[PDB]
Symmetry: C3
């Protein structure tokens, strides 16, 4: 196997961009669920469709979406992906994570990723948001790691570490940032596990994941994080718990995608603003 | 990655069939181990080789077999696969599970799958049959899920649920159906875990699988079930425990395929008739 | 999927070799870490680069290395791979394990493999060497098993067993061989788990692996062992624990590849000689 992209394809995509917009972003954001809004919270908004951008993964089947939106979020220069790629759609991971490498070349130095995810910790509840303190990359154990293949020294090392992937500073700020707006639910913290999907977990599987010590489960994110870290970026992210994963044979409920888009609307602005004020914590460039 | 088959390839395979046999099956059965017999228990039997059928995965290396057999089993219209495809043979999962999609288009609305499997629960013994109440789809965690790729809305949703994959009704009937023939061994019930093979588990691996809460382990089935569910079918199945998986370093025994084909002959008719009377439980069409 | 090599490609590579060197090895050794030295400990040393050898996986990117070195180690006819292939580099497993099949055709009947690996057992310490008593083949669970595809009856069975992969005799000799040179650290024994890499584990992942009962973790070896066993070879191996895998969020240390090459030099000769005297235990040919 081999990454389809050549070092220089990344550079070409970046420069293109570096010259079709005045913006120079510092924070990349990958939503999410609605986030929805954040496109409005932005200001100075300049949109591109993925389809216009050299090399950008070709999202394949319409529906899709596919806008890079650059602008300013709470006094930070931002670029946000509305719609992402997933392994379950058929993309090899070096396509799923291509944007991340573009972002680093645009000058970006922090990455914020968010997602919807099923709650595995029985303590959680629908609507909680969970801060990501660590992950379990199950696909990665078997081979599906977006770094598989020859390493490009210009991006990072052959064997990078992930033990510190979720910036401790940013996690503190966020827990602080959240109490100083006081809320009826606390900010949650824990381990995200990625599985590949696209079908949802059985009860026994859900039990496996709890045993492994996962608190939440979803189908993305982890690869983008690994590539972000390989690159140098500072990374921080979290999960809107959109559903309690099932957990015993009694219950007559199942997990669906109605509930995920629905819930994504309950917290539509809860997060819209969370992320937005979070911006003020993220350091600045020298 | 991409499914090699186009929506219309399925339709073409079905129609072909829908016109080379008078039968219209309602129950698909995928054996199994011998089952062997069931070809005889059938009546009105019309055979096809896979090799004659448009698009049917090309089983590759002779030995193989490869007969679709249509007919009547205990007053149900049935179609049965004698010999199946496996991931360990090299087939992508969208080939392994192609027949299942054909069956749905033939009008079939229930699927019965069976297999041989190693016992992980120490309580089980060689010869038991285990009813499948749930699965752990380890390949699926990493990417090897037969639904990976663009979803075809005409078959099912993008994110289907598997928490209820093994029809509770059918499981009751079967446990009942079995006591009303009274036996010296009970019907067993539990979790099937799929691993990809083709080599057999080490002791440490066997220990991993017990810890995860699996009761039996084999190399198939799960994908066909996921595709069956994605499609609407009612699904029910089980495992002939052909061997006790090893479990500690003391023992001087290993797992082989002699014992699997051998044992498959001990229960040759035990199941031959089990499945056969089971037919009478499965509802009917309106 | 399909193995790229044809039965006869193996034969062609072997014969070539069987006629460009006088040596006829009995023991294949796959290092390792430095082992470094063993090239010197050899005598009668005849080197080939992989690049000169028909069919030998093309190591792709220079740096690489790539010497088969034949000769005599402590009165055994040996062939040793300096540098190996890994799944994380992009090679399909049927390339990673190609040499092993060549070795069997050269007449070789034992295989010794060694590697660097992170310690998961808290009892271990940097510098220990761990004897491999068993493995957990996580990639194998999902599909990445070097035997996937049509089986070639001339090498081995379709469904071979791995429960006895690590020769009990050889393990005894080694534990004995080691006490009769008395040391301040004991020889360690346990389970090696393979993960695919190339990035290092998170804390949560490390915790998963302990729970599964792994004592050490690395990114290779297991596939070569499975192919060795499929073939008939006697197999024995171990791990230089080059680093203690991290294990809790407190610690401010990470895993790197400095430490792995460094430590590989601490034990440079500790193992250089261990393997070397080990030679005297391995039986002989009739
Ligand atoms: O319970 C779950 N299991 C796995 N994934 C998801 C998700 C995320 N939501 C999306 C579809 O429900 C999908 O893209 C997935 O990443 C929400 N809940 C769950
Ligand atoms: O102990 C086991 N582990 C994994 N698979 C099997 C099987 C099933 N039997 C077949 C070969 O033994 C194979 O197709 C597999 O699906 C029986 N026992 C075991
Ligand atoms: O803690 C670890 N996790 C996974 N692999 C390794 C290794 C082995 N060392 C090499 C790179 O560090 C790599 O080829 C891997 O197989 C040493 N330590 C660890």
């Amino acid at each position: 196997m081999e990454n389809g992209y050549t070092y220089e394809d990344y550079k070409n995509t970046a420069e293109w961009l570096l010259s079709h917009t005045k913006h120079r972003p510092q924070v990349a954001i990958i939503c999410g669920s609605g986030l929805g809004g954040l496109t409005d919270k932005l200001t100075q908004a300049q949109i591109f469709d993925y389809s216009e951008i050299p090399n950008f993964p070709r999202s394949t089947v319409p529906g899709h979406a596919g806008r890079l939106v650059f602008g300013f979020l709470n006094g930070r220069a931002c670029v946000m992906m509305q719609g992402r790629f997933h392994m379950y759609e058929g993309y090899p991971l070096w396509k799923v994570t291509f944007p991340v490498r573009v972002f680093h070349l645009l000058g970006v130095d922090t990455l914020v990723v968010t997602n919807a995810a099923g709650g595995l910790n029985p303590k959680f509840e629908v609507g909680d948001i969970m801060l990501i303190r660590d992950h379990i990359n199950l696909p990665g154990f078997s081979g599906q790691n977006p770094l598989r293949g020859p390493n490009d020294e210009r991006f990072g090392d052959r064997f990078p570490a992930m033990s510190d992937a979720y910036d401790r500073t940013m996690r503190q700020r966020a827990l602080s940032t959240w109490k100083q707006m006081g809320e009826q639910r606390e900010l949650q913290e824990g381990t995200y596990v990625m599985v590949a999907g696209p079908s949802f977990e059985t009860v026994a599987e859900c039990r496996v994941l709890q045993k492994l010590g996962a608190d939440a489960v979803g189908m993305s994110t982890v690869p983008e994080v690994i590539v972000a870290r390989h690159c140098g970026l500072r990374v921080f992210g979290f999960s809107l718990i959109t559903n309690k994963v099932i957990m015993d044979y009694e219950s007559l409920e199942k997990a669906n995608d109605e509930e995920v888009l629905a819930a994504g609307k309950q917290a539509a602005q809860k997060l819209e603003q969370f992320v937005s004020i979070l911006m003020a914590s993220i350091p600045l460039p020298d």
